[PDB]
Amino acid sequence: HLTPEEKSAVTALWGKVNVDEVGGEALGRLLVVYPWTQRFFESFGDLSTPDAVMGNPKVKAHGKKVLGAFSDGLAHLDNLKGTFATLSELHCDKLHVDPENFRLLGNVLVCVLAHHFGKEFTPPVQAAYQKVVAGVANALAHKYH
Amino acid sequence: HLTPEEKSAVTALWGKVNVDEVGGEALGRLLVVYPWTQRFFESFGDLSTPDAVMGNPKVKAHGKKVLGAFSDGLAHLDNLKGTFATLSELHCDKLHVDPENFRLLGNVLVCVLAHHFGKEFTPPVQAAYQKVVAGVANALAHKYH
Amino acid sequence: VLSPADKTNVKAAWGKVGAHAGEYGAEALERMFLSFPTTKTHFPHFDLSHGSAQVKGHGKKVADALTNAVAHVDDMPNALSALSDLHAHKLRVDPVNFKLLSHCLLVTLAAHLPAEFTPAVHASLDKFLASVSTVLTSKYR
Amino acid sequence: VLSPADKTNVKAAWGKVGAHAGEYGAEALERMFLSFPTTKTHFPHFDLSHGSAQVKGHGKKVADALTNAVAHVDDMPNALSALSDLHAHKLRVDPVNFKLLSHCLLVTLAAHLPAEFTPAVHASLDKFLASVSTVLTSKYR
Ligand code: HEM
Numbered sequence A, B: 001h002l003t004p005e006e007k008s009a010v011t012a013l014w015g016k017v018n019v020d021e022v023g024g025e026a027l028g029r030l031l032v033v034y035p036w037t038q039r040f041f042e043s044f045g046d047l048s049t050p051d052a053v054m055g056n057p058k059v060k061a062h063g064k065k066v067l068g069a070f071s072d073g074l075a076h077l078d079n080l081k082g083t084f085a086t087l088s089e090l091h092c093d094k095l096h097v098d099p100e101n102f103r104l105l106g107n108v109l110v111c112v113l114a115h116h117f118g119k120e121f122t123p124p125v126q127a128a129y130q131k132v133v134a135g136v137a138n139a140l141a142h143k144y145h
Numbered sequence C, D: 001v002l003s004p005a006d007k008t009n010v011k012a013a014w015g016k017v018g019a020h021a022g023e024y025g026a027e028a029l030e031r032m033f034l035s036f037p038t039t040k041t042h043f044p045h046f047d048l049s050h051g052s053a054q055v056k057g058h059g060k061k062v063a064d065a066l067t068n069a070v071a072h073v074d075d076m077p078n079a080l081s082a083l084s085d086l087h088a089h090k091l092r093v094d095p096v097n098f099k100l101l102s103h104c105l106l107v108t109l110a111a112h113l114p115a116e117f118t119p120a121v122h123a124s125l126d127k128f129l130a131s132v133s134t135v136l137t138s139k140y141r
């Protein structure tokens, strides 16, 4: 569970995030760093190089959708399973996304926040975000069956 | 969450388990299959060969204690975190045991059950046991800090 | 790396499996699907019920690949290269799933090899399946 | 496998680390201890408080080993031979912990090398740390 200080730390940093920018960046980096994750995005067009993935408008669009949902979930840190249940069911039942992808995206997101905020993304802040991304990934995998 | 069918499966098979013998077999196999785990049993004597590990009285004795605790946990499948809290704290604070070993022992125990029971350890019985060993390992790692 | 004793142990155990390898391959996939439900995300086009011909057909392929690996245990990367490509560039199964199938294969062998599955043989087979797994994910990135 | 572009990427990024390698190693360790507290079971003998001489010293040991590895990127198994021996025979680090420290080193580099941490370099670095990790656990069994 996050402590009160950790919750505040997450909230404070996130207030400085450009969710569409960070989303586009985290999803693109997911596709570059862990390229097997491109299997869900064969209809997205050019994914041939790191620059093409990062600049792909459909990758960017999907990133803003995914991170906007993540973003909205930060308001329900004590009800992550409830918040993401229907999205968990969808990801399992219709999209067939292996829940490890949620963990991978979480780790890329942390790397992006570190890149973006530099020294402000301190060890304690990171520790707090690790609980958040673990918690979101666990929530998204919770309804898999 | 074990289903009712899953709980019955676990219970029925556990009535046939000689906890002392299976405990000794499973701990020995953990030390043979993942030999760096021998590092947590520095004073246990001869661990030089597979036969020496399996036949070591300290290994057999310890395995009996470890599986006895696991066995007692089976009466509390809905409250594994609470049932193993004291042992979790012990394993973290005093024994300094890497918690991934709880997962590894769980898997070796599943392999021992499959070996010992053969065909009666069906895919569904196995699945019930996998949820249990995952729950016990999570419960044993829960108090780490 | 697989030692000479590991290779001996793998060949003896797989040799005892013999003609049941395909059946054991399907059993291990069934074991995997039931035990680790997230692995089913890679097979939405399959009937995963017990006895499915799709699982049996795929179990035979997996087992045949393992037989091939045992047969070329000193040259596994090349024997499995087409499968490494397929998994890396087409199927794109997360690498974490290979450890789940390897445990289920091990469990399947244990349930069918009362004499053979000694601690040492178990250890060798674990190593072998991890090595096969490593080869299969070697081209992912 | 590390491609040539990967090696180029790692050498460039890790060379930028330069004289800070020791400080970054310590920060990566601190990031790991706070983010993944179960990793602290491997250092019960240490003063793990922030700024501890012991963590700084161990951070420099870890970084210098990574410097060695980058420098001898085509022959990591040989270059890290004594370390792979030590980890396999004297320590008891489950292999999962290597992913955790590798993620914390990436975070550290990301936080300190804004200009160098591109998507491609991030991928290269990740692959490199995984490769180092593989070398360090290669003699475990
Ligand atoms: C932070 C974790 C994630 C969140 C919160 C999230 C959220 C969402 C949302 C809100 C949608 C749209 C749902 C709808 O159309 O009703 C979606 C769709 C989708 N997501 Fe996830 N997602 C996450 C991670 C991932 C990952 C890691 C992948 C794959 C690597 C993925 C693959 C997809 C796909 C393929 C779709 C369908 C998109 C389309 O049809 O255009 N998601 N996700």
Ligand code: HEM
Pocket (backbone or CB within 6 Å): B037, B040, B041, B062, B065, B066, B067, B069, B070, B087, B091, B095, B097, B101, B102, B105, B136, B140
């Ligand atoms: C099923 C999971 C486990 C359970 C329920 C469990 C339970 C126990 C119990 C009950 C004791 C104290 C025995 C007594 O009363 O004397 C103990 C001690 C210990 N356990 Fe665990 N254990 C588990 C897994 C492990 C694993 C996987 C390891 C290491 C790889 C481990 C390492 C130890 C050590 C080193 C001790 C102290 C032994 C000594 O006195 O030298 N345990 N455990």
Ligand code: HEM
Pocket (backbone or CB within 6 Å): C039, C040, C042, C043, C058, C061, C062, C063, C065, C066, C083, C086, C087, C091, C093, C097, C098, C099, C101, C102, C132, C133, C136
């Ligand atoms: C010992 C490890 C594995 C081996 C030896 C193996 C081998 C194979 C083989 C031989 C094929 C058929 C290739 C062809 O049709 O040309 C295949 C296909 C496939 N494998 Fe793997 N595999 C392994 C692990 C996995 C895992 C862990 C998963 C996912 C959980 C997976 C998912 C698939 C899928 C989805 C297919 C396509 C099946 C179809 O649509 O018919 N494999 N694999």
Ligand code: HEM
Pocket (backbone or CB within 6 Å): D039, D042, D043, D058, D061, D062, D063, D065, D066, D083, D086, D087, D091, D093, D097, D098, D101, D102, D132, D133, D136
């Ligand atoms: C990038 C991966 C790693 C590298 C390059 C690395 C490198 C090293 C080096 C250079 C030493 C010092 C040996 C000496 O003094 O000669 C060491 C020791 C040690 N490492 Fe590793 N290590 C890595 C991963 C890990 C991980 C993940 C853990 C556990 C979480 C770990 C636990 C230890 C411990 C406990 C020691 C002994 C420390 C002491 O008592 O001074 N290592 N490592």
